[PDB]
């Protein structure tokens, strides 16, 4: 319920292109990223997280300690500097990324076998569902 450890296989991905567009990802690369199968690998140890979301051409990596603000440079995404902070709101893992973009961050709900991930930027929300492999 608070345990996010695992290798996570995607089963659905809603409004992916609206969220990428809100981040200003190149329209060309958007309709490549649309094609790619993603595997989310989470290593969680106490407060310390290592998140690795992987695909053929394109990976997103982040490591953080819950409750410790960190500078994040989204080099493989929109290549912006944000002030990221990840915390627990109940059993909901919440990341707020302060910077140019408003309403920017993500949330993870872990429901036994299922991981629900909502990514937000501006007025767009991308809803993803992964299953533990």
Ligand X SMILES: *C/C=C(C)/C=C/C=C(C)/C=C/C1=C(C)CCCC1(C)C
Residue nearest to ligand X (CB): 33
- We find the least distance from the C-beta atom of residue 38 to ligand X, in angstroms, to be 4
Shorter beta-carbon distance to ligand X: residue 20 or 82: 20
Backbone Cα Rg of the chain = 14
- Phi, psi angles (nearest 5°) of residue 107: -140, 140
Find the length of the chain: 133
- We find the least distance from the C-beta atom of residue 75 to ligand X, in angstroms, to be 12
Residues that bind ligand X (CB under 6 A): 20, 33, 36, 38, 40, 51, 53, 55, 58-60, 106, 108, 117
- We find the least distance from the C-beta atom of residue 86 to ligand X, in angstroms, to be 9
Q: Are 32 and 38 in contact (CB under 8 A)?
A: no
Distance between CA atoms of residues 43 and 79, nearest Å = 24
Q: Are 9 and 133 in contact (CB under 8 A)?
A: yes
Shorter beta-carbon distance to ligand X: residue 51 or 82: 51
- We find the least distance from the C-beta atom of residue 96 to ligand X, in angstroms, to be 12
* Residue among 2, 10, 3 nearest 130 (CA): 10
Shorter beta-carbon distance to ligand X: residue 22 or 53: 53
Report residue 62 as tokens.
């982040």
């Amino acid at each position: 319920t608070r345990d996010a450890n695992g290798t996570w296989e995607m089963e659905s991905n809603e409004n992916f292109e609206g969220w990428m567009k809100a981040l200003d990802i190149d329209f060309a690369l958007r309709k490549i990223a649309v094609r790619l199968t993603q595997t989310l690998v989470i290593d969680q140890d106490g407060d310390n997280f290592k998140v690795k979301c992987t695909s053929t051409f394109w990976n997103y990596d982040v490591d953080f300690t819950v409750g410790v603000e960190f500078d994040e440079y989204t080099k493989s995404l929109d290549n912006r500097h944000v002030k990221a902070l990840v915390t627990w709101e109940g059993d909901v893992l919440v990341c707020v990324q302060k910077g140019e973009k408003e309403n920017r961050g993500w949330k993870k709900w872990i429901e036994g076998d299922k991981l629900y991930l909502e990514l937000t930027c501006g007025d767009q929300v991308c809803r993803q569902v992964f299953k533990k492999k």
